[PDB]
Amino acid sequence: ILSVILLFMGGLCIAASEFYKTRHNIILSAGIFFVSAGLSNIIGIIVYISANAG
Amino acid sequence: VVVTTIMESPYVMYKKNHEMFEGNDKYEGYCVDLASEIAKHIGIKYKIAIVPDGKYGARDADTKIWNGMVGELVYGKAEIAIAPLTITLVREEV
Amino acid sequence: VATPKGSSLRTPVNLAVLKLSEAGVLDKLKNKWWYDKGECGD
Amino acid sequence: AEDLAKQTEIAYGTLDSGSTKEFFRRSKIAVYEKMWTYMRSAEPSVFTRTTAEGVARVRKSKGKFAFLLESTMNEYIEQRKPCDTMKVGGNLDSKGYG
Amino acid sequence: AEDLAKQTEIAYGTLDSGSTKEFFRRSKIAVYEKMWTYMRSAEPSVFTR
Amino acid sequence: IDFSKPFMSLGISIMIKKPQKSKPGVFSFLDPLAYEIWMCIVFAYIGVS
Amino acid sequence: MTHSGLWRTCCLEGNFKGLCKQIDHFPEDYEADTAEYFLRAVRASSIFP
Numbered sequence A: 001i002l003s004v005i006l007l008f009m010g011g012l013c014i015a016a017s018e019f020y021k022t023r024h025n026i027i028l029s030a031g032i033f034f035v036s037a038g039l040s041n042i043i044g045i046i047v048y049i050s051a052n053a054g
Numbered sequence B: 001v002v003v004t005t006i007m008e009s010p011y012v013m014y015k016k017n018h019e020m021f022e023g024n025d026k027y028e029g030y031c032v033d034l035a036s037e038i039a040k041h042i043g044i045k046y047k048i049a050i051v052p053d054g055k056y057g058a059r060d061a062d063t064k065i066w067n068g069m070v071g072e073l074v075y076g077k078a079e080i081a082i083a084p085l086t087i088t089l090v091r092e093e094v
Numbered sequence C: 001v002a003t004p005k006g007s008s009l010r011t012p013v014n015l016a017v018l019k020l021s022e023a024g025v026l027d028k029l030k031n032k033w034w035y036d037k038g039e040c041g042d
Numbered sequence D: 001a002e003d004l005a006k007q008t009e010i011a012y013g014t015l016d017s018g019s020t021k022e023f024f025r026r027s028k029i030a031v032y033e034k035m036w037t038y039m040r041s042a043e044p045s046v047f048t049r050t051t052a053e054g055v056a057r058v059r060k061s062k063g064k065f066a067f068l069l070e071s072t073m074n075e076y077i078e079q080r081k082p083c084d085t086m087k088v089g090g091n092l093d094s095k096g097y098g
Numbered sequence E: 001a002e003d004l005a006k007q008t009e010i011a012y013g014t015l016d017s018g019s020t021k022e023f024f025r026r027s028k029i030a031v032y033e034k035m036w037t038y039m040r041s042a043e044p045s046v047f048t049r
Numbered sequence F: 001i002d003f004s005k006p007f008m009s010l011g012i013s014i015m016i017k018k019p020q021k022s023k024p025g026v027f028s029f030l031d032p033l034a035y036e037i038w039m040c041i042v043f044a045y046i047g048v049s
Numbered sequence G: 001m002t003h004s005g006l007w008r009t010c011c012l013e014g015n016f017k018g019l020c021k022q023i024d025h026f027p028e029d030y031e032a033d034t035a036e037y038f039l040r041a042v043r044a045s046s047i048f049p
């Protein structure tokens, strides 16, 4: 679920990057969210597989 | 019929509420479902009756008195002993 | 081990087979005519 | 069963007035006979009144006692709580219920 | 000796008129007896001179 | 006929022509680790980079 | 002893010394694993050599 939230948050930063064009840290914030979302997806897959081994 | 059986597990257990039923309904296990099947075919009304002395059965060499289920049948205190009763020679002659 | 209906050789045969089981006879018979005959054991 | 003869610290017994006890008494085997004499003269009482007492005693024993019983009763205890008993070794004789 | 009973392709025998041969003949053991009968009826001659 | 007590124990069973031992697969070098680990190693490799 | 070749095997020291026979690259002895059927197809046709 956290991965879904981070991807949604990253999308808003991309969407907001066409209004506040002067600001540049918005594009960086999106990059962190999409990378962080990927790392959260790794944990979810590992936990799901590990639990099914119980 | 007076069925003779002994309190073991999972042969004759009890339910989570064993204070309120009445009769054979209160017994559950492997030798109570088998007894139902054995009596549904032959067509008899069995009555479960837990062995009083509470032993599987043996013969005291001293007095030759057969105790337990095996000794609960030779005298005439029951007919059908549906329980775990291994087959041995000491019991095959009685 | 069967026997014809009424045959007086029912009660001695039954008990007999039960004698062999409590003496370690049957178990040894099985171990010898089965396991020992193993011609294909890295 | 042979491994029991290899030691004496660990005790063992059989249920009273039950087929298993009668088997050792009349067993004319070299190993089974030995066991019948070890337990009959061993203090305190190893021949438990009921199976429930014997199994519980082995649990509290922590490994110094081995309970000898039929396989069928040895399969609704290893798969039931607290799941602290295990069957070691095959069967000694082939018998059935009736 | 037991491992011999596990197979039949490999043959075996004992010297003639020698203590070893007499041991199997009169051995009242379960395994040794079996061997005495395997060799006595086995062709060709395993009992070397 | 009046049967007696079982002297031995049996039971129906399927017999099949013993299938010869197989040759380890062409990609047997992936066997030491489960398919899940290989999948996660790829994800870790991408994530770390 | 046979000096087997890529296509046909022949005879060496023996009763026959020149007799050659086309090798049967698909011998029937069982089952033909789909990965084993494609190895013997590439072998038989010697496409790579």
Ligand SMILES: NS(=O)(=O)c1cc2c(cc1Cl)N[C@H]([C@H]1C[C@H]3C=C[C@@H]1C3)NS2(=O)=O
Residues within 6 Å of the ligand: B087, C018, C021, C026, C027, C030, D094, D095, D096, D097, F005, F006, F007, F008, F009, F010
């Ligand atoms: N293990 S076995 O199949 O060789 C084997 C199987 C069996 C044997 C004896 C042997 Cl040796 N005897 C028992 C018999 C003894 C008494 C208990 C059950 C019957 C009456 N039947 S069995 O349980 O079918």
Ligand SMILES: CCCCCCCCCCCCCCCC(=O)O
Residues within 6 Å of the ligand: A006, A025, A028, A029, A032, A033, A036
């Ligand atoms: C619970 C784990 C959360 C992981 C995801 C959190 C990502 C946070 C991203 C913040 C980016 C900030 C970049 C701009 C910083 C600045 O203003 O200097």
Ligand SMILES: CCCCCCCCCCCCCCCC(=O)O
Residues within 6 Å of the ligand: F026, G035, G036, G038, G039, G042
């Ligand atoms: C890009 C060109 C690549 C050429 C080399 C690829 C060779 C692939 C394998 C060819 C032979 C395969 C034989 C069957 C193997 C098997 O399934 O056991």
Ligand SMILES: N[C@@H](CCC(=O)O)C(=O)O
Residues within 6 Å of the ligand: B056, B057, B084, B085, B086, B087, D015, D017, D018, D019, D020, D021, D051, D069, D070, D073
């Ligand atoms: N039920 C068996 C005995 C069971 C046991 O000794 O554990 C009998 O016929 O006596």
Ligand SMILES: N[C@@H](CCC(=O)O)C(=O)O
Residues within 6 Å of the ligand: E015, E017, E018, E019, E020, E021
């Ligand atoms: N030395 C043996 C003969 C050799 C053997 O028995 O193998 C004997 O006293 O007869």
